[PDB]
Amino acid sequence: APESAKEAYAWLAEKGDFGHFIGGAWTAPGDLFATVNPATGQTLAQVSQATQADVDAAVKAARKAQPAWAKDGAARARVLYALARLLQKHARLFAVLETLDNGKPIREARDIDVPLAQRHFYHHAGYAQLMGTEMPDRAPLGVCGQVIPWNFPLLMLAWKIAPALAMGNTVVLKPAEWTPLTALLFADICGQAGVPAGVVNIVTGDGAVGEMIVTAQVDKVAFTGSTAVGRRIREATAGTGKALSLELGGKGPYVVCDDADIDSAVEGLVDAIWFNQGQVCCAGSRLLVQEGIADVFHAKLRARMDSLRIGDPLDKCIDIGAMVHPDQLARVRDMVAANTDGEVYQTAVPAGCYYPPTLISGLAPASPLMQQEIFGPVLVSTTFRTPAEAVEIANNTAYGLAASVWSENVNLALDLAPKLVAGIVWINGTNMMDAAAPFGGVRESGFGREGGWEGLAGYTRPAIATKSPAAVAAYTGDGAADGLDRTAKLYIGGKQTRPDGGYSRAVYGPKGKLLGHASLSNRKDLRNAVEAMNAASGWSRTTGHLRAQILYFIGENLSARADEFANRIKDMTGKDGKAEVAASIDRLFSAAAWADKYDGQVKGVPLRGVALAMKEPVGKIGILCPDAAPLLGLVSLMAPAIAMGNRVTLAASEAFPLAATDFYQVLDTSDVPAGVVNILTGAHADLAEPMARHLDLDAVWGLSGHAQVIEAASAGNLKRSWTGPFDPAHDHTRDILSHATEVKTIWVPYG
Amino acid sequence: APESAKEAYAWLAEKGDFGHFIGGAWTAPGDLFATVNPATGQTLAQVSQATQADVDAAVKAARKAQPAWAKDGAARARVLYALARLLQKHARLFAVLETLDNGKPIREARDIDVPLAQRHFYHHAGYAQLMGTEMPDRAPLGVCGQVIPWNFPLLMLAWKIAPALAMGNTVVLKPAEWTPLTALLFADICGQAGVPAGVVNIVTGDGAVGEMIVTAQVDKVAFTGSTAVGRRIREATAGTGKALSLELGGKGPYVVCDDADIDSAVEGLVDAIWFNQGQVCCAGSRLLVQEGIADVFHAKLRARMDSLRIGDPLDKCIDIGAMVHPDQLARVRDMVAANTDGEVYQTAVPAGCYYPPTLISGLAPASPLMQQEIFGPVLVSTTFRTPAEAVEIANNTAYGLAASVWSENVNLALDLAPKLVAGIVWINGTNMMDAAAPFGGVRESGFGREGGWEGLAGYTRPAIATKSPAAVAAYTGDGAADGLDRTAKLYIGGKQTRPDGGYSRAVYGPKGKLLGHASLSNRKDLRNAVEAMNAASGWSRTTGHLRAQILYFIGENLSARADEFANRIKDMTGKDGKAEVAASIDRLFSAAAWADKYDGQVKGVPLRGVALAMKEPVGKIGILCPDAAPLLGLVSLMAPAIAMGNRVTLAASEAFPLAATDFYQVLDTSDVPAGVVNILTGAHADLAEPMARHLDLDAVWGLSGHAQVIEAASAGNLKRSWTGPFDPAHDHTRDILSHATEVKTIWVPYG
Numbered sequence A, B: 001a002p003e004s005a006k007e008a009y010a011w012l013a014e015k016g017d018f019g020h021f022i023g024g025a026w027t028a029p030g031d032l033f034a035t036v037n038p039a040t041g042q043t044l045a046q047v048s049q050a051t052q053a054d055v056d057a058a059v060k061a062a063r064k065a066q067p068a069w070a071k072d073g074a075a076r077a078r079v080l081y082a083l084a085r086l087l088q089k090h091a092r093l094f095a096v097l098e099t100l101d102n103g104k105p106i107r108e109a110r111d112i113d114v115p116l117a118q119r120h121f122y123h124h125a126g127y128a129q130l131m132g133t134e135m136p137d138r139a140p141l142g143v144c145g146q147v148i149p150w151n152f153p154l155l156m157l158a159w160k161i162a163p164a165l166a167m168g169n170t171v172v173l174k175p176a177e178w179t180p181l182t183a184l185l186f187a188d189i190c191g192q193a194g195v196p197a198g199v200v201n202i203v204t205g206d207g208a209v210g211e212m213i214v215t216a217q218v219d220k221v222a223f224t225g226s227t228a229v230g231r232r233i234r235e236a237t238a239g240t241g242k243a244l245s246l247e248l249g250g251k252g253p254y255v256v257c258d259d260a261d262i263d264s265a266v267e268g269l270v271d272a273i274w275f276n277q278g279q280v281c282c283a284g285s286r287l288l289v290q291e292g293i294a295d296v297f298h299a300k301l302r303a304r305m306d307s308l309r310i311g312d313p314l315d316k317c318i319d320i321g322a323m324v325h326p327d328q329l330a331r332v333r334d335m336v337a338a339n340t341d342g343e344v345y346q347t348a349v350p351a352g353c354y355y356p357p358t359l360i361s362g363l364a365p366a367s368p369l370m371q372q373e374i375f376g377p378v379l380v381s382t383t384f385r386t387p388a389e390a391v392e393i394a395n396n397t398a399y400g401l402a403a404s405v406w407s408e409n410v411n412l413a414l415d416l417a418p419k420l421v422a423g424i425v426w427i428n429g430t431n432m433m434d435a436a437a438p439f440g441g442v443r444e445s446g447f448g449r450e451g452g453w454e455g456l457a458g459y460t461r462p463a464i465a466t467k468s469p470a471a472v473a474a475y476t477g478d479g480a481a482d483g484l485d486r487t488a489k490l491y492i493g494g495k496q497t498r499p500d501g502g503y504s505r506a507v508y509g510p511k512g513k514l515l516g517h518a519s520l521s522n523r524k525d526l527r528n529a530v531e532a533m534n535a536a537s538g539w540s541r542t543t544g545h546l547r548a549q550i551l552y553f554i555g556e557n558l559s560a561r562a563d564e565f566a567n568r569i570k571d572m573t574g575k576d577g578k579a580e581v582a583a584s585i586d587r588l589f590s591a592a593a594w595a596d597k598y599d600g601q602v603k604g605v606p607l608r609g610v611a612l613a614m615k616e617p618v619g620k621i622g623i624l625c626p627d628a629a630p631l632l633g634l635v636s637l638m639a640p641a642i643a644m645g646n647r648v649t650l651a652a653s654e655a656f657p658l659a660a661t662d663f664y665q666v667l668d669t670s671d672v673p674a675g676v677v678n679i680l681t682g683a684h685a686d687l688a689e690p691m692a693r694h695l696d697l698d699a700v701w702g703l704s705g706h707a708q709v710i711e712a713a714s715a716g717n718l719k720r721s722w723t724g725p726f727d728p729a730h731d732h733t734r735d736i737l738s739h740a741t742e743v744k745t746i747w748v749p750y751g
């Protein structure tokens, strides 16, 4: 006997045709479109396609309510707590409504979706309580536009709304056009929880309403959804000064070693088949099994797949629900029709909007199905021989979200996990989620983290704003020839290199004295720099202690030439350079200090074990330095970057390049390994787009302008970007460490 | 061919008879006693027995230099870095000198002692660099008296001096009377490193000079050495307001599971036989082997023990050196002569001050040798059947310092480790040490941590001092009888209990109105409370989420009665109680916030893997609340304690008990599990000594005075203590979380 939907149908009947939740109240229904129960084919309700006028109104209500909301964090905590209690009281109503709207088994909605949504609000209440005293240097961003997909409607809403509200922001959120209902119910309890009017605003519609939110007068955009829409959002927000987080999916690898717990590994994969749909952090879809056990593993997998029960999602004895929508069904069918590799195995499926669990095995690692996105309850599988080959196959995609590793051996599991490119790695489990544990992607899975103390950074700004210094025009001079040899080069791969293009410009002091010449880098020089950083990948695997020693040497050797550097700064700018040199020395010693002291966080979780929120290097970073602070700007950016294990290519000050070129000898005398620090001089108009575009860079920092061009071009590979503000005279070290690292969360057994 | 000591003998000849290093200079030699090379029997040098006048002078020089030293953390970093570089340049001299003085193999001094000492100074330089910006609410303590033992002379010095100096303190340190030389050489390089005069002071002598330092005008005492001297130091410093850390030894268990790597486990134990001497964090001496592999394991152990090379410690091909002193030799011989259990196996030993590696096997878990201290290169062994039995045998001593666990299984290793009572647990290794990883004991192994960010807390105070409110005398009244029933009880084990002694006192308001009666607890009531906390041990194993929910309930149910509580406060004190109630609610919501958010730290280390610096509950805590703040004082102390997993017994305000007694119903309505919170009322003169004495409490917090009595009585079981200052009107939550937790560092494979 399946579960009753009487209460949910009753709420739907009460609410009628839906408008939006704006400014604390329901607007009149507008231009209506149906949401349909995918299991019965019946219309559940009519919802509105928001107009531009609605989106403007919702953003204006969020703006009007935000400052009083931000003022009192203890009062925000009470509201988030009340929202969690209402989610718990109305648990059954939320679960049934999710199943009706989305098609998922009532048992998943009741045991997974709604419990985790409650926990997210319970847990984040406390961040609001603690923000004033524990994050005193942080402040709200303001208004957050939020857009989410159809696979986990309530949970995806909680992941967006709870940390935004906790940190004193207000929200305009649009659920997916296929799954609006539980967000509309969440709106309908906001009054009861004490949510002040206009702090939460829910508008419904398709991607066109999403586009209006993304380009609206908001301080933040947070998106979960497809990679392609992610790219367009990165482009539409380029140069606007908005904060941006993107969770873009990518279904992750499930590594099963020769000594894994076979039965638990099979069961974990089966229990994940229905869960692994849409753009969710998850593992299971790319099955990588050591060749010695692959046949036995696949044989058990097919049999356990046969035990999965398909049908009525309101039946708590059902494991496979209805596909979310006929279009999604057809996408799955088309994917299978488009594949010609492997051996397809399918359980039977009943009539209607159902698709059966499917295993496509016998793929070679190079097969497109191993690298393309996967849709539906579909598994693809390949084998490996050695753990190093498993790492290689797992990291050989454009994605990087979550991974799973199964081994009973204490070493193998803990040595494989950090080598996989992901924001999350589960050891002897999969799809483990907790509000205290950050989750999010690298590569084309996007950027940003949700959950934990770590997730709060994306919903705050520094309490005291800094301001990038204005550009400075290079000094001019008469143009007589230099009888002495004073033409600086570039610094690439541990040695000085002529610019590929052969050109250099004269550098003149404040009164037109010719000081020397500096090279003009081009794209071929940058590409040589990137190859030099690729050869220096070992630097990302060194100890913190080794990197500290290096930075101490750089600091020492700068001190030995401190007078020379100050006079070079004075020659170029006319201002005394001693204070800038003393501060550049200091920034090095601060970075040396930090190199072995930026700790990962151990999270307690209600599940098995603990979540280890590790810090990791971003990788290779291209950096454009400001005109001002010829030496301080370069060193302040370079030093925390390499302290944390990154390799960097810096475009030195365009107005005043000769301090950076004098620094070459400092790097050589300090034994900076080749490729760890590369330095380009010349016109930033020539380099900004190439550095932001480059497909083999993991981050671009543009602190000399060109923010729009840089942020737009970063969409090519969805690299992280930072375009300031950056004030060299301000010690940004601690914040730069955050720009220079990624969080990877490793879930391990414990206690 | 053994190593040359020409350079070390030359330095010894240059320095002559030794005075002390005081105020930046060497004092005249005084009352001389010899330090003797234990391998040759030859006198190495004469050193001075410091007088009281010397100790006064050294402390006065440390005091005179400290404030200018504390002012500039970047300059302190340069000095610590220079000290590390000098340790590295003179590495060979330090190593040889350590071997000459102590007897240890030159290979250990050169590969372990001196490298780790360098690393400690390199690593801690950075804390000095970062202190101003990253610990802005913290300030130096001032002058530190430091006393250390003979087993690792240079390394023990580095563990004391480097964090003290980094945090802006100055030091007076006394090495052990048997091993002064490398501390005197460390003194001899301080000038070259830029150590300003009087920032480091080294005085030599026996325990009588240690006694003078401990009771001198210093702000901190830090001791490593025997449990008995630790107790006397806790007593001599009782009531003085001095900070205190004690590292008291206890040789730790080495758990070898049925599925361990047998050969690596045996080798790790053999390579640890010589290392595990004196009061050092170490594991190996108590061998616990699963019964299925015990015979094969012991057979391999005896054979590998035979391969250990004994002789000339200046020979780099030697594993077993000379015993540190003839008295230590005799202590070992007496221990073996005193034992009658087990089967003793011994390798041969050569003539002189040598003792051979010894295995005493076949002990039952109850044998004294399994629980007493062990001396020399001696191993004792017993077997177990199940992992739970291994946990039981390992935790069945008065000690709790370090432990080792060997298993190839990913779960078993990570599930056994947190169950062992220790400050350190090594998985598939032993005696792993790093400057970033905290180490220190629980139980009779002492208290405090050395190393890492965590170790800095013991060398700092809050930058802004707070002040405990003055005592308040209970109001008096005429003494007419109460025709109504208004006699409050105690709250013990989840239910209200009459005081064992049967007595209660009348409570009068400011004008002599009889408000009711409050019970007078005695030692039998406290003992009932402790048994109630023992039955509530499960609370220490709950999730952070469960504990948060409980605290939220307490906060909610206090809010429901907020007017009643404010009027009760007003009845007792004559002052309006609304603000105290609102703040008591807030403290609960802050603690609820923190319950699932106080994260452990993941340390990068130059060795295999990572060090997980976990937070853990202290356990059972007895708390004495101040007179002032009848409700705020109790709640502010109770709530962070139970947020972190502790069970508590609080002695409520002596002047104003009736708010705490009204709180009983709040605990019952909030479903606080029985024994988690117990409340005693009555005279703190009756309870202070019993709570500080009690052998089954892990900590005592005395915030109502009696500091001397409490701190002295805490020496019985060497429980942690805190005697303030505590100002209820100040939000101490974050600092109380530190009082309410212990750090356990778990070293695990990784990458």
Ligand SMILES: NC(=O)C1=CN([C@@H]2O[C@H](COP(=O)(O)OP(=O)(O)OC[C@H]3O[C@@H](n4cnc5c(N)ncnc54)[C@H](O)[C@@H]3O)[C@@H](O)[C@H]2O)C=CC1
Residues within 6 Å of the ligand: A147, A148, A149, A150, A174, A175, A176, A177, A205, A206, A207, A208, A209, A210, A211, A214, A224, A225, A226, A227, A229, A230, A232, A233, A327, A328, A330, A331, A332, A334
């Ligand atoms: N049978 C087939 O071949 C089907 C193809 N698709 C296609 O998949 C693509 C995206 O897949 P979905 O699962 O729908 O994820 P999505 O990325 O389109 O949706 C995630 C969220 O983004 C919103 N959104 C969509 N476009 C946006 C934009 N330009 N700006 C801002 N927000 C926007 C959506 O309304 C939704 O709430 C589309 O090209 C769609 O046509 C999906 C299903 C059927």
Ligand SMILES: NC(=O)C1=CN([C@@H]2O[C@H](COP(=O)(O)OP(=O)(O)OC[C@H]3O[C@@H](n4cnc5c(N)ncnc54)[C@H](O)[C@@H]3O)[C@@H](O)[C@H]2O)C=CC1
Residues within 6 Å of the ligand: B147, B148, B149, B150, B174, B175, B176, B177, B205, B206, B207, B208, B209, B210, B211, B214, B224, B225, B226, B227, B229, B230, B232, B233, B327, B328, B330, B331, B332, B334
């Ligand atoms: N053959 C035997 O039976 C021997 C017995 N022992 C005994 O062991 C006990 C302590 O063992 P040790 O290894 O020497 O460690 P310890 O705890 O005595 O020494 C650690 C450090 O504490 C200093 N110290 C000693 N007493 C002190 C005090 N009252 N106040 C402050 N500092 C003090 C010491 O001088 C040393 O630098 C003593 O009772 C000693 O007589 C040690 C060796 C030989």
Ligand code: NA
Residues within 6 Å of the ligand: A035, A036, A037, A038, A100, A101, A102, A178, A179
């Ligand atoms: Na629907």
Ligand code: NA
Residues within 6 Å of the ligand: A441, A442, A443, A444, A445, A446, A447, A717, A718, A719, A720
């Ligand atoms: Na990315």
Ligand code: NA
Residues within 6 Å of the ligand: A604, A605, A606, A607, A608, A609, A610
């Ligand atoms: Na857990």
Ligand code: NA
Residues within 6 Å of the ligand: B035, B036, B037, B038, B100, B101, B102, B178, B179
């Ligand atoms: Na000696």
Ligand code: NA
Residues within 6 Å of the ligand: B441, B442, B443, B444, B445, B446, B447, B717, B718, B719, B720
């Ligand atoms: Na203790």
Ligand code: NA
Residues within 6 Å of the ligand: B604, B605, B606, B607, B608, B609, B610
């Ligand atoms: Na390591």
